[PDB]
Coordinates of C-alpha atoms and ligand atoms in Angstrom, one line a residue:
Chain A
X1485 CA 0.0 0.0 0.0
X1486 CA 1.0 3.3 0.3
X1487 CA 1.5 6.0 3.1
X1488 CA 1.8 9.6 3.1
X1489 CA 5.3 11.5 3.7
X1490 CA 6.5 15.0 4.4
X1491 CA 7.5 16.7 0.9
X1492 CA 9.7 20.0 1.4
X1493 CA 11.1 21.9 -1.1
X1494 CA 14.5 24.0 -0.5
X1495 CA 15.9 26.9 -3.1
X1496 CA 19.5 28.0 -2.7
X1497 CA 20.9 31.7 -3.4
X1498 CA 23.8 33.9 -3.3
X1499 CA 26.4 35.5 -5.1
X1500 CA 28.5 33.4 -7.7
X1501 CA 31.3 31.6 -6.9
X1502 CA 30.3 31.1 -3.3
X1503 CA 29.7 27.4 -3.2
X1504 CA 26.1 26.9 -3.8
X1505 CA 26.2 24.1 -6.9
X1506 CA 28.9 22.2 -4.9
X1507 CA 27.2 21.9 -1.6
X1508 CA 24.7 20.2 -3.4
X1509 CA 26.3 17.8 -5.2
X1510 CA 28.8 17.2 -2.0
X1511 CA 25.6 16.2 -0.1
X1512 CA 23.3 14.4 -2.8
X1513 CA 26.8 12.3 -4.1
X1514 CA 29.4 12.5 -1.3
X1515 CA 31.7 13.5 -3.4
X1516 CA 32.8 17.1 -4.4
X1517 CA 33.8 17.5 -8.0
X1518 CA 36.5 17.5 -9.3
X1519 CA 36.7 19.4 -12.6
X1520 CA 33.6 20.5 -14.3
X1521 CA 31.0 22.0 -12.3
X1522 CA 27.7 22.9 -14.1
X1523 CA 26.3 26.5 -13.3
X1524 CA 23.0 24.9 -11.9
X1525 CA 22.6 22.0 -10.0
X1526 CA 20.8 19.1 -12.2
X1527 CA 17.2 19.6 -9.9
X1528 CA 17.3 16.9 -7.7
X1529 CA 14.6 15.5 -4.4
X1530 CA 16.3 13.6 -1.9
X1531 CA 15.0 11.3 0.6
X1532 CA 16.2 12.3 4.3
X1533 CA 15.4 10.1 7.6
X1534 CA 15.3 12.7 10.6
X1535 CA 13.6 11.3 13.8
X1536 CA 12.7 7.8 12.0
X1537 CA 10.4 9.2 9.6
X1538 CA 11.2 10.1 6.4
X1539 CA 11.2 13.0 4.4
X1540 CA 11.3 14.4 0.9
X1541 CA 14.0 17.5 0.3
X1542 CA 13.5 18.9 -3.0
X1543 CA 16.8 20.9 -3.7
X1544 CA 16.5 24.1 -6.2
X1545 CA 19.4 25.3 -6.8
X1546 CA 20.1 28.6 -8.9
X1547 CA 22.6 31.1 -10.2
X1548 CA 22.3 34.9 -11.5
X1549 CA 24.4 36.3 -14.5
X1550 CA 22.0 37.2 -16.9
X1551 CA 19.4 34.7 -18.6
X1552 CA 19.9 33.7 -14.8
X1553 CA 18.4 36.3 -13.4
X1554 CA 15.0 36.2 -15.3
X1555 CA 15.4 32.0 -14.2
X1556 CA 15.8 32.3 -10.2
X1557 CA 12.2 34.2 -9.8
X1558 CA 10.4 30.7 -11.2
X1559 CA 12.2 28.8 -8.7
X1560 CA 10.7 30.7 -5.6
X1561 CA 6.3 29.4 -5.4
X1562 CA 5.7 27.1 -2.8
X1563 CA 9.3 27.4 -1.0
X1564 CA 9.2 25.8 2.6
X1565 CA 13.0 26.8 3.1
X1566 CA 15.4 28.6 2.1
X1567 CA 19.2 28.8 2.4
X1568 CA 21.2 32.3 2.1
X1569 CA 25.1 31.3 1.5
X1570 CA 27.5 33.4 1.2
X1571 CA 31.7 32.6 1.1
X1572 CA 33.3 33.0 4.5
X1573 CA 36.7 34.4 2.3
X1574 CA 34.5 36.7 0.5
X1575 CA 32.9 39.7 2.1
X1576 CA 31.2 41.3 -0.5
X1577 CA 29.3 37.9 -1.0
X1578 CA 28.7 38.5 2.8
X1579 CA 27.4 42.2 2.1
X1580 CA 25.1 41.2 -0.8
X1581 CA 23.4 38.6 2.3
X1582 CA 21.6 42.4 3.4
X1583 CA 21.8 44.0 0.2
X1584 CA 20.0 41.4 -2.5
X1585 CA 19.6 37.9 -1.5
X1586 CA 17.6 39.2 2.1
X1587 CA 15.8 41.4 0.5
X1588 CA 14.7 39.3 -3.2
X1589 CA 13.7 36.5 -1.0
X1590 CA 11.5 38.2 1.8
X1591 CA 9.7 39.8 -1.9
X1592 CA 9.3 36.2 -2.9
X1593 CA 8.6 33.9 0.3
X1594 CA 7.4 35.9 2.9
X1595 CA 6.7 34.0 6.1
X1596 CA 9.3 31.1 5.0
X1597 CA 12.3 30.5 7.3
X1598 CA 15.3 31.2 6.2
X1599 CA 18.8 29.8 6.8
X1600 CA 22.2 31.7 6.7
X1601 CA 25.0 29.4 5.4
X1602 CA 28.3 30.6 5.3
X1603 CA 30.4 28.7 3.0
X1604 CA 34.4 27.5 2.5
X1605 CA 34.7 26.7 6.0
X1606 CA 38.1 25.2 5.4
X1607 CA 39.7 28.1 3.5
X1608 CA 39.4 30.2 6.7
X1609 CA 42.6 28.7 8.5
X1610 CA 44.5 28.4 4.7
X1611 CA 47.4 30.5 5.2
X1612 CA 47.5 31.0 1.1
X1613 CA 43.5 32.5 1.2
X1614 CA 44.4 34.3 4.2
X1615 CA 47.6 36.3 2.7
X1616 CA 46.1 36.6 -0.7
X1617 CA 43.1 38.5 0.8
X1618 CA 45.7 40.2 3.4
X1619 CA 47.2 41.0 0.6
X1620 CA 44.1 43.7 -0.3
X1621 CA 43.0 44.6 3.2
X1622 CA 40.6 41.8 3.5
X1623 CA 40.1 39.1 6.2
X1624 CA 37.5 36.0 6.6
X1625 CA 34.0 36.5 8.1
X1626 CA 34.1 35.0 11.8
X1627 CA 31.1 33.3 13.7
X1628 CA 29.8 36.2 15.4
X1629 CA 29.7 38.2 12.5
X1630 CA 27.6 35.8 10.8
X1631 CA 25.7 35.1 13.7
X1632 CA 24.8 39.1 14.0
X1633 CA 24.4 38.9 10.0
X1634 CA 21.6 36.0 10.3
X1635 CA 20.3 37.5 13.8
X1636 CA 19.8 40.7 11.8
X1637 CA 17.8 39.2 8.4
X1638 CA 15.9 37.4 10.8
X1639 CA 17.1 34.1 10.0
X1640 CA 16.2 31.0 11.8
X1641 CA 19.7 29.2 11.9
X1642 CA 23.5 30.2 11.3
X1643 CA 25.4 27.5 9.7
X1644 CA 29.0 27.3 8.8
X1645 CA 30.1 24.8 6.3
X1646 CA 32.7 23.2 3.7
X1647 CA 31.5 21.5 0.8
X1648 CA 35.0 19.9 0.2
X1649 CA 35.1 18.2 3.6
X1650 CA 31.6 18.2 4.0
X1651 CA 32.5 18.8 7.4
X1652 CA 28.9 21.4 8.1
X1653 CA 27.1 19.9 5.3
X1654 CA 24.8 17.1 6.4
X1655 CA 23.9 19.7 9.3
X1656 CA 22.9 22.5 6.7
X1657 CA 20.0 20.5 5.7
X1658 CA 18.8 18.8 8.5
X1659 CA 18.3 22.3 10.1
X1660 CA 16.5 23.6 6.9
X1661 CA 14.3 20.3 6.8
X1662 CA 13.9 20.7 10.6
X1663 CA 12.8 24.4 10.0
X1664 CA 9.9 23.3 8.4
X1665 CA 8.8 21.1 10.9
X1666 CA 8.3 24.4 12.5
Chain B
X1085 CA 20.6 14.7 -49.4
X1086 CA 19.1 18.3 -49.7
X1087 CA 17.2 19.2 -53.0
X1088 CA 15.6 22.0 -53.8
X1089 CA 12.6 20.0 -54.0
X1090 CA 13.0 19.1 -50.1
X1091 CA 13.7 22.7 -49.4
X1092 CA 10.1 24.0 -50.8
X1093 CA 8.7 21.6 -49.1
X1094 CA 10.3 22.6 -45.9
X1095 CA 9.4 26.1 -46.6
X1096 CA 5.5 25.6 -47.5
X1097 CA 5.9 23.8 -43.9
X1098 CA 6.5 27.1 -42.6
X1099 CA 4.2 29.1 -44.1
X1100 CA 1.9 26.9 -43.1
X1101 CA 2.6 28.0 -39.5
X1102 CA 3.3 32.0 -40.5
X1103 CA -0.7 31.9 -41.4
X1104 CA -1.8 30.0 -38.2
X1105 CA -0.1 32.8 -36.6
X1106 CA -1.5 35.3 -39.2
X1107 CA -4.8 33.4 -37.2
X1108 CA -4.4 32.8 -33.9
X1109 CA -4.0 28.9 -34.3
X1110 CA 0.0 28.3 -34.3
X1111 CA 0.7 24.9 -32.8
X1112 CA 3.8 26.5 -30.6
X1113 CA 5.4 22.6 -30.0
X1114 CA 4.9 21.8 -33.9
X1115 CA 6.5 25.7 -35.4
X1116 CA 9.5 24.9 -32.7
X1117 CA 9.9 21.1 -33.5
X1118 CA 9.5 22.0 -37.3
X1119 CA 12.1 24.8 -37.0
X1120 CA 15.3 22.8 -35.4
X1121 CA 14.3 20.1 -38.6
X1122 CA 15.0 23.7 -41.1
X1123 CA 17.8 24.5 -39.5
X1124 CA 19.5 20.9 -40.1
X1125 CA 18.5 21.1 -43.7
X1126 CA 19.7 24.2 -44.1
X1127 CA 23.3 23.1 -42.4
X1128 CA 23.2 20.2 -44.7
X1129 CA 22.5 22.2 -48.4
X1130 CA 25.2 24.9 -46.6
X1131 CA 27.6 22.2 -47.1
X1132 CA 27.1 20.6 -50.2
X1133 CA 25.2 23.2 -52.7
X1134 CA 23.1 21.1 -54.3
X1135 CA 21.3 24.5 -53.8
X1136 CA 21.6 27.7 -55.2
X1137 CA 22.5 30.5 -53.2
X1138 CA 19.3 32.8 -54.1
X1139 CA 17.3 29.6 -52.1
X1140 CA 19.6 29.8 -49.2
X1141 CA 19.3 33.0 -48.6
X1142 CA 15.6 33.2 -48.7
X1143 CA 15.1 29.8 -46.7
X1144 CA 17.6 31.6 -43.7
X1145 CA 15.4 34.6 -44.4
X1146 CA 12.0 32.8 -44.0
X1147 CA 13.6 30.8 -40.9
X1148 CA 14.4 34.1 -39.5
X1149 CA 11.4 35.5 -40.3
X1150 CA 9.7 32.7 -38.5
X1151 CA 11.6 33.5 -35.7
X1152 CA 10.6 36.9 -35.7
X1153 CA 6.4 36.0 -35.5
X1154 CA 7.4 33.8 -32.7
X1155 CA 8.5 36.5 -30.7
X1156 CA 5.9 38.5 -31.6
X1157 CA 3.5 35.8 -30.8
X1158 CA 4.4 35.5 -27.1
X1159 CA 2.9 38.4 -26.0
X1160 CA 0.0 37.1 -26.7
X1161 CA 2.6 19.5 -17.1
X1162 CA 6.2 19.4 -19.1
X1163 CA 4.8 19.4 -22.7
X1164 CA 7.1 21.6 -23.9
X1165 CA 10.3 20.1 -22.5
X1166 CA 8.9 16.9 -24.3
X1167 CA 9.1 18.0 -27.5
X1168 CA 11.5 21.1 -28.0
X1169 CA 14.4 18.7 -25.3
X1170 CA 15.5 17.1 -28.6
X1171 CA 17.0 20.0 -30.5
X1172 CA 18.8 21.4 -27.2
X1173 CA 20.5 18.0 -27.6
X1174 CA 21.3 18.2 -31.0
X1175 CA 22.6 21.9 -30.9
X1176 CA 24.6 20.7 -27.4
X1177 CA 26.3 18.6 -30.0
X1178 CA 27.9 21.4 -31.9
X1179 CA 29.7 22.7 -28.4
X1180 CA 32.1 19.7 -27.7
X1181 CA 32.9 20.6 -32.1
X1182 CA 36.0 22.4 -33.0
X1183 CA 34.7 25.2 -35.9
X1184 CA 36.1 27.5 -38.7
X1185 CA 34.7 30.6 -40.0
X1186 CA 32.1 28.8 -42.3
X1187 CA 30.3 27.5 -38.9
X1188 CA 29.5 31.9 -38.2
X1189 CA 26.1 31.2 -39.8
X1190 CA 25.3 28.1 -38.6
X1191 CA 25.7 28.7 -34.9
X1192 CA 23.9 32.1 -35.2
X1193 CA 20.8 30.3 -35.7
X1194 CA 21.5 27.9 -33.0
X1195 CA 21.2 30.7 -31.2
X1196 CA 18.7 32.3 -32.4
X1197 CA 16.5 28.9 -31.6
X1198 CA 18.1 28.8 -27.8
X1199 CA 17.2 32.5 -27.6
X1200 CA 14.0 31.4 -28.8
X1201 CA 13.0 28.2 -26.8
X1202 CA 14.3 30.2 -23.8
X1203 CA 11.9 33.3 -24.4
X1204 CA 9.0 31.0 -25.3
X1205 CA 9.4 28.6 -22.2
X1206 CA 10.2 31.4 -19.8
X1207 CA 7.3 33.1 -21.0
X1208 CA 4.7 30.0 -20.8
X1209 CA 5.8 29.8 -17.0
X1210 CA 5.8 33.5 -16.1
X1211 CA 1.8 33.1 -15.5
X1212 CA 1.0 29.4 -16.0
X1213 CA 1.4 27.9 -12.3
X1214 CA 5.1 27.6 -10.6
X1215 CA 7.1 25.5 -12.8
X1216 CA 7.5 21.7 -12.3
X1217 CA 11.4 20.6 -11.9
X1218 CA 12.1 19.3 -14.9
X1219 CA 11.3 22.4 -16.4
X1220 CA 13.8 24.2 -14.3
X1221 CA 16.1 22.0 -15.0
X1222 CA 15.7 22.5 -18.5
X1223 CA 15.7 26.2 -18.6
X1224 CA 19.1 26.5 -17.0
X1225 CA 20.5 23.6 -19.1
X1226 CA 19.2 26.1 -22.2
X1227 CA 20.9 29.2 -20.1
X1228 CA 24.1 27.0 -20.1
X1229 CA 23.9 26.4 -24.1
X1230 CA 23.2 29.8 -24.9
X1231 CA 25.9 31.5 -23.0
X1232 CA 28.6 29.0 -23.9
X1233 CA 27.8 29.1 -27.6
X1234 CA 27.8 32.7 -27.7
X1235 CA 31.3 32.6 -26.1
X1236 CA 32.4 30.7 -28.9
X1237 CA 30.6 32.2 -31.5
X1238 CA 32.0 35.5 -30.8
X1239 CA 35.4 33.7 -30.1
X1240 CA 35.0 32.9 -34.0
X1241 CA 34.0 36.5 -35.2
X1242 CA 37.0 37.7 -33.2
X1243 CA 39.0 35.9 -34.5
X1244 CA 37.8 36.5 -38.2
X1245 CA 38.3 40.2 -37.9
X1246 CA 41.6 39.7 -36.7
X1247 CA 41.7 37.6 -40.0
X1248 CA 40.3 40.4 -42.0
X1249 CA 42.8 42.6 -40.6
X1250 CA 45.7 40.5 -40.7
X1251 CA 44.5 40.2 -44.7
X1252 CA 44.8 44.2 -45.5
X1253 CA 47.8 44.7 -43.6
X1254 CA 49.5 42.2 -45.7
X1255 CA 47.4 43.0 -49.1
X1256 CA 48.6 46.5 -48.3
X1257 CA 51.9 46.1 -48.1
X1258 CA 53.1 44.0 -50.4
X1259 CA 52.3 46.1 -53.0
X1260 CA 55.6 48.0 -52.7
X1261 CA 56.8 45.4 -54.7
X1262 CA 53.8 43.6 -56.4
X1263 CA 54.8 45.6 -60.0
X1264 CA 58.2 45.5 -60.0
X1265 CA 57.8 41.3 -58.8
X1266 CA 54.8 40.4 -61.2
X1267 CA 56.2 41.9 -64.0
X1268 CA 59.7 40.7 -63.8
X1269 CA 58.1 37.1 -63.1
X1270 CA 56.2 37.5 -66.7
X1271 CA 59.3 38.5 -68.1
X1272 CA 61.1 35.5 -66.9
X1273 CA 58.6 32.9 -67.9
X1274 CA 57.8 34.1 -71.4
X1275 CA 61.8 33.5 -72.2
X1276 CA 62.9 29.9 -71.5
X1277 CA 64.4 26.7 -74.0
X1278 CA 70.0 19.6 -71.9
X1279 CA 73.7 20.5 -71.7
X1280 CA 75.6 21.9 -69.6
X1281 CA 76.0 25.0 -71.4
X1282 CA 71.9 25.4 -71.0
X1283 CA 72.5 25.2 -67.6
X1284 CA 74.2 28.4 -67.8
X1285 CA 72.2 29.8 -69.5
X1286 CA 68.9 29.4 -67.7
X1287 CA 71.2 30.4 -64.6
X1288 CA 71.9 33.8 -65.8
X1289 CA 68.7 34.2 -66.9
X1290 CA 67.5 33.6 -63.2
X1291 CA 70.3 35.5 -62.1
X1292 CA 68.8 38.9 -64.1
X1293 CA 65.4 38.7 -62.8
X1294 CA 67.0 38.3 -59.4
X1295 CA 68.8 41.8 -59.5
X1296 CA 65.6 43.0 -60.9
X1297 CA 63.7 42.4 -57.6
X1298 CA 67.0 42.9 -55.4
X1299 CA 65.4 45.5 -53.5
X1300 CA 62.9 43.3 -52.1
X1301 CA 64.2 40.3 -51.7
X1302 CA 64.0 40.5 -48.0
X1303 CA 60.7 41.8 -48.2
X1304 CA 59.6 39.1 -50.1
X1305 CA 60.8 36.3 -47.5
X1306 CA 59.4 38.1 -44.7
X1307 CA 56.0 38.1 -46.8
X1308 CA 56.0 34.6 -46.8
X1309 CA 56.7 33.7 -43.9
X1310 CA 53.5 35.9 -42.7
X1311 CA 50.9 34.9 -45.6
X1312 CA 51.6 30.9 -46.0
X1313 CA 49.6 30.6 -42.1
X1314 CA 46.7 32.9 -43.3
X1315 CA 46.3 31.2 -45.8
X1316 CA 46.5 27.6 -44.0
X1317 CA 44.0 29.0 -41.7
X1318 CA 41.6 30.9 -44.1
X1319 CA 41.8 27.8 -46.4
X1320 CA 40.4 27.2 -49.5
X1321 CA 36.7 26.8 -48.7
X1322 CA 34.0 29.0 -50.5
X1323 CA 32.2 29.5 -47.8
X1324 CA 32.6 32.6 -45.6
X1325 CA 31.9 36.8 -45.9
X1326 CA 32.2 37.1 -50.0
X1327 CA 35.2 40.3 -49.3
X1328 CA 37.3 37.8 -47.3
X1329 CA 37.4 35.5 -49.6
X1330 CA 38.1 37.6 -52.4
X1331 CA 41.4 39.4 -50.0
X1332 CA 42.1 35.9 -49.4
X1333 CA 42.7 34.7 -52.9
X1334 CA 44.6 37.9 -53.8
X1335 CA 46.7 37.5 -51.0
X1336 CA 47.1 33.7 -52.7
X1337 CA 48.1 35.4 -56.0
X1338 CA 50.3 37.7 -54.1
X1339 CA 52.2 34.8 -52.3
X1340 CA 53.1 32.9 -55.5
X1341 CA 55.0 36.0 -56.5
X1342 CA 56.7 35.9 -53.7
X1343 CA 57.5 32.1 -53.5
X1344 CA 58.4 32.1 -57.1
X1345 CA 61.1 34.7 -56.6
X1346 CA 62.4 33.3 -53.0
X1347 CA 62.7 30.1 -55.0
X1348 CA 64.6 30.9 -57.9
X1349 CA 67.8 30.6 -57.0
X1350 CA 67.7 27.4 -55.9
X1351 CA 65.6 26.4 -58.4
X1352 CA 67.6 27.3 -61.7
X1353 CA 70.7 28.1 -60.5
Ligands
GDP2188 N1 38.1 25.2 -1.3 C1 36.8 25.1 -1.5 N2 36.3 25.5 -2.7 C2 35.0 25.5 -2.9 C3 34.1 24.9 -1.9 N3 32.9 25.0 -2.4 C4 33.0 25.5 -3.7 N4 34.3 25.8 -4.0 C5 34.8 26.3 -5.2 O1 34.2 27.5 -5.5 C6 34.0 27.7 -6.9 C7 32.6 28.0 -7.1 O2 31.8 26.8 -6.8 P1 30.3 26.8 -7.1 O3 29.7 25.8 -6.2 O4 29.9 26.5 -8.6 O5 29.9 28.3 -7.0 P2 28.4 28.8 -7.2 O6 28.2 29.7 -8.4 O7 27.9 29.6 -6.1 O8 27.5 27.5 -7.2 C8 34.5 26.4 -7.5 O9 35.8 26.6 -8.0 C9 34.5 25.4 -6.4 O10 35.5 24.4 -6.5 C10 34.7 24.5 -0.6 O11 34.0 24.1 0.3 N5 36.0 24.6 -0.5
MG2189 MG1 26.6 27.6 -9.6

């Protein structure tokens, strides 16, 4: 026979470049890519257990360019969750968090929770990333300033995270799933 | 292989869709499914003839002109993907290809139909429901074609006017010498009879027309050595802009010149 489950549907933004297509494929295939790395995320629903009953995580990812940005409005209806990211060595991908990706999604989901990710966990203590953005007056984001970011847009959770050692990652979405859940 | 006969009836295809427009009737997944089918038949006459060129040029018009109502149409479940998924597939072919300057025309339509499924599709969902996944996931997959292939695409038109400009510099200069060179060449050819005494002789004859150039026999090397790669990589193909190719085979007449006289010596004498 059959029996109902909970379906949810996620949509990822932020800026380019700051880890959203990998993060998905790093959670859906355990494996972050190697070369190659489409724009967009191939949509994808995945089947996560979380307190013995199972659930249904629809993962939308998207991008913005140009053709993009007339795209990432369609993915928005009926969004139970959504994830902000931006890159932890990269703080104007931290500043468009309040600028844009607050702003565009409150427009399109008002009332859904939202979760802040920060990304590239593991480039924070790489002493190469570190001089490199020394090396224009630039340093990593740190906890508490994400925290205060996310406390300020009003999100739900703050969740740090590394696609490459998928060290946050299975977290990310159990929160977002668990969001919904109230 | 493509007729002329096929090509009519490909085009009465599409007036047949022009006057269900004309109407208010246009079968949106037949005109698009239809279209990618024109656009292989036209890539297939391209590169054969077959066809005359007053044809091709009013079968890309009427294509384009198809194109156009489309557009103009617009204004005013995933059955789409299901039919229009196929030629997204065919043109994602032509990406992983390695193209020349005859392939401008050719991937300008391509684009012109991404362009095109992308504005209808878009367009269809903007105000019919939220869109289902697979739908999405088409729509960037079309983003993805149409920005790579007009990277390459205006890779290749770069490229061509570098080619073009490359052409007149050389076309431009050579003719310093092109008189003096041709002439003395015609001279040379319209005198020649073995022994060894005919040996000498042809050698001095060489020898005169040498001096005759002697001003630019350096010029004439460095020529070369410049012209022989344009004209490996412009070819000998009829197809491309109708001004390059007409540079290009002067340049090729130009070049002979050249390689006659930087041959000579060894040659004769
Ligand atoms: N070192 C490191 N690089 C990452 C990580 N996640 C993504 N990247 C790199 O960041 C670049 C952008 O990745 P991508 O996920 O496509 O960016 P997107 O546009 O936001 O989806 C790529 O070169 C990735 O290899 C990570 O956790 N660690
Ligand atoms: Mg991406």
């Amino acid at each position: 026979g059959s029996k109902l489950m909970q379906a949810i549907k996620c949509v990822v933004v932020g800026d380019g470049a700051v880890g959203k297509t990998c993060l998905l494929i790093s959670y859906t295939t355990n494996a972050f890519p190697g070369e190659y790395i489409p724009t967009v995320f191939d949509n994808y629903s995945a089947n996560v257990m979380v307190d013995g009953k199972p659930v249904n995580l629809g993962l939308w990812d998207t991008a913005g360019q140009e053709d993009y940005d007339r795209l990432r409005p369609l993915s928005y209806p009926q969004t139970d969750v959504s994830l902000i990211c931006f890159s932890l060595v990269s703080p104007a991908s931290f500043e468009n968090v309040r600028a844009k990706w607050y702003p565009e999604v409150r427009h399109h989901c008002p009332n859904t929770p939202i979760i802040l990710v920060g990304t590239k966990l593991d480039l924070r203590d790489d002493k190469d990333t570190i001089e490199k953005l020394k090396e224009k007056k630039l340093t990593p984001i740190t906890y508490p300033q994400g925290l205060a970011m996310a406390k300020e847009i009003g999100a739900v959770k703050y969740l740090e995270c590394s696609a490459l050692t998928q060290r946050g990652l299975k977290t990310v979405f159990d929160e977002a799933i668990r969001a919904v859940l109230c | 292989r493509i007729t002329p006969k096929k090509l009519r009836e490909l085009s009465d295809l599409l007036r047949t869709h022009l006057s269900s427009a004309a109407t208010k009737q246009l079968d949106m997944g037949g005109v698009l499914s239809d279209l990618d089918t024109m656009l292989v038949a036209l890539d297939k006459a391209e590169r054969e003839g077959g066809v005359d060129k007053d044809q091709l040029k009013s079968f890309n018009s009427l294509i384009l002109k198809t194109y156009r109502v489309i557009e103009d149409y617009v204004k005013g479940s995933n059955f789409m993907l299901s039919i229009v998924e196929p030629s997204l597939q065919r043109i994602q072919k032509h990406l992983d290809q390695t193209h020349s300057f005859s392939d401008i025309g050719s991937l300008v339509r391509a684009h012109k139909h991404l362009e095109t499924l992308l504005e209808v599709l878009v367009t269809l969902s903007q105000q019919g429901q939220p869109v289902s996944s697979e739908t999405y996931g088409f729509l960037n997959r079309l983003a993805e074609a149409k920005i790579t292939l007009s990277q390459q695409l205006n890779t290749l038109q770069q490229q061509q006017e570098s080619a073009k400009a490359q052409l007149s510099i050389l076309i431009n200069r050579s003719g310093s010498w092109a008189d003096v060179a041709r002439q003395s060449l015609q001279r040379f050819d319209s005198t020649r009879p073995y022994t060894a005494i005919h040996r000498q002789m042809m050698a001095a004859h060489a020898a005169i027309t040498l001096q005759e150039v002697s001003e630019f026999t350096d010029d004439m090397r460095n020529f070369t050595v410049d012209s022989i790669p344009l004209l490996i990589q412009l070819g000998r193909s009829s197809l491309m802009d109708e001004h390059l190719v007409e540079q290009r085979e002067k340049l090729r007449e130009l070049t002979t010149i050249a390689e006659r006289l930087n041959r000579l010596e060894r040659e004769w004498m």
